[PDB]
Structure formats: C-alpha cells, structure tokens
Design a binder for this molecule. Structure first.
Ligand code: HA4
Length: 133
C-alpha cells in the first residue's frame, strides 16, 4: 500500500533538522549548508522494489530496497548502516542501525503532504514535502 507515497516531492518546511544532524555528529559546516538546502525526494516502485532518490545542491543519495528486507546503506553523512523499510500504520518506516545506535525516518501523508519525522537520541525533526506534478 505504498502507492500514495510515489512521486516527486520538494522540501517546503523543516523543524529541528540541525538538532537531528548534531545528534548524529554531523560537523557544523555541513549542518550550515544542509540548513539551507531544499532536497527533492523521488520515490518509485518496480514490482516490489522501491527506489528512493534524494537530490540536492549539496548531497545526493539513492537507495533501492524490498519492503521488509534488510539492506546495507551508506547515508548522506557517511554512516554505514543496516536498514529496513516497512509499512506500519500506513506510514513508511525506515529504521537504520549501526554501532548499536538506531535512527528512524518515518514518512506519512497528512492532507496530501508528506511529513518526514527523523528521530535519533532525543532529537526529533519534522520535514514537510509537497508533491511536484
Ligand atoms: O530526506 C531528508 O529531508 C533528510 C535527509 C537528507 C538530507 C539531504 C540534504 C542535506 C545533506 C545533509 C548531510 C548531513 C546530514 C544527513 C542526515 C541524513 C539524511 C537526512
């Protein structure tokens, strides 16, 4: 039931992303640039393989995965993690594990907007994306 997440999405609001990045140990210069970057996220499916692209003027990433199947990932901040993405309560939940640490990247649809909640430690960041035509 991932279909409503598919498409091209643009960042239109960000709350507490610096706190999230700081919690992950991201350096101040990268945080500075990141705080002024507006990514485009593209979510595509081919059968039961999802591909999630994050494009920006600063960093770009791409992951492909099957729901519910662990995959290796190297994040935009260069963490090497073990990841799984699932649907839970209609939300796309991406869990990353490394060094006994965890972070979740939770996507939900609210009134047509895609709300991405990033949690690590006590830091909770909420980013809002709107759908591009
Ligand atoms: O998808 C999001 O909106 C958040 C992730 C991507 C951010 C891409 C733009 C800025 C690059 C920042 C690099 C250091 C922090 C990366 C944290 C994980 C990816 C967040």
């Amino acid at each position: 039931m991932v279909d409503a997440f598919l498409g091209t999405w643009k960042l239109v609001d960000s709350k507490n992303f610096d706190d999230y990045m700081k919690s992950l140990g991201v350096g101040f210069a990268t945080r500075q640039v990141a705080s002024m970057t507006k990514p485009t996220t593209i979510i595509e499916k081919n059968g039961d393989i999802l591909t999630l692209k994050t494009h920006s003027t600063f960093k770009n990433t791409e992951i492909s995965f099957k729901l519910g199947v662990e995959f290796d990932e190297t994040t935009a901040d260069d963490r090497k993690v073990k990841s799984i993405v699932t649907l839970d309560g209609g939300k796309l939940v991406h869990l990353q594990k490394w060094d006994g640490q965890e972070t979740t990247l939770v996507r939900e649809l609210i009134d047509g907007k895609l709300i991405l909640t990033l949690t690590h430690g006590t830091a909770v960041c909420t980013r809002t994306y709107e759908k591009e035509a």
